[PDB]
Design a protein around this ligand. Sequence first.
Ligand SMILES: CCCC[C@H](NC(=O)[C@H](C)NC(=O)[C@H](CCC(=O)O)NC(=O)[C@H](Cc1ccccc1)NC[C@H](CC(C)C)NC(=O)[C@@H](NC(=O)[C@@H](N)CCCNC(N)=[NH2+])C(C)C)C(N)=O
Lengths: 99, 99
Amino acid sequence: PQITLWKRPLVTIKIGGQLKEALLDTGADNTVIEEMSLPGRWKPKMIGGIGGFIKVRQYDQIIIEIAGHKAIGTVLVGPTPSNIIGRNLLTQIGATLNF
Amino acid sequence: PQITLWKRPLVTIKIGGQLKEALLDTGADNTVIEEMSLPGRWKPKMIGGIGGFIKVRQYDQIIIEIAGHKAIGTVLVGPTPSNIIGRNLLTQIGATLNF
Ligand SMILES: CCCC[C@H](NC(=O)[C@H](C)NC(=O)[C@H](CCC(=O)O)NC(=O)[C@H](Cc1ccccc1)NC[C@H](CC(C)C)NC(=O)[C@@H](NC(=O)[C@@H](N)CCCNC(N)=[NH2+])C(C)C)C(N)=O
């Protein structure tokens, strides 16, 4: 599809059996998902942006469905104010910026 | 042009007559630039991100060239870890996310 930017680009994702809404963010290197009991091993991590850093748990090899497209990669889980799909996943679904 | 996301989507912008580099960011409502002198009246504002809130100066109706495409609108200047071109200006140059 083609997403215009008049409003935040929100899509439905399916992660670990749960369907959610996440922001497609070209300025995010990583994918950050809201607090959730995901099964599996994880590593403690810290990520930053505007305002500072937050503590997250890093899960690798996660499978996620972005608007009907499958991708597999690292997902960071923590108290983020919003679910964010970073470039790590965006590249796997062939997303581009056009103008 | 068509920009893939294997690398950060960085472009050269010009503001106040000074060249700069910035990140095309679909997950930002606004355009934030690192602290600099910009001619004009500005107002105190607060914006938030992944790590919290930061104080910025709001500059209304500023002229800016992004990758050679002209935009005129609000630019916020503050302690950002990276220069960011948000949706308010991305819409002005006709940018859309595609996949
Ligand atoms: C229109 C009026 C707005 C008023 C104002 N609005 C806001 O603050 C809105 C919600 N904020 C935003 O849109 C802000 C950007 C600032 C702005 O646009 O104003 N967006 C953001 O901060 C979004 C996340 C987000 C989006 C929506 C809601 C909440 C959070 N992140 C943008 C950000 C860009 C980065 C280069 C600094 N990316 C990140 O923070 C990601 N982090 C990373 O990718 C790290 N690996 C690297 C960080 C440093 N980068 C670098 N050196 N290149 C991500 C994994 C957290 C508020 N006061 O009410």
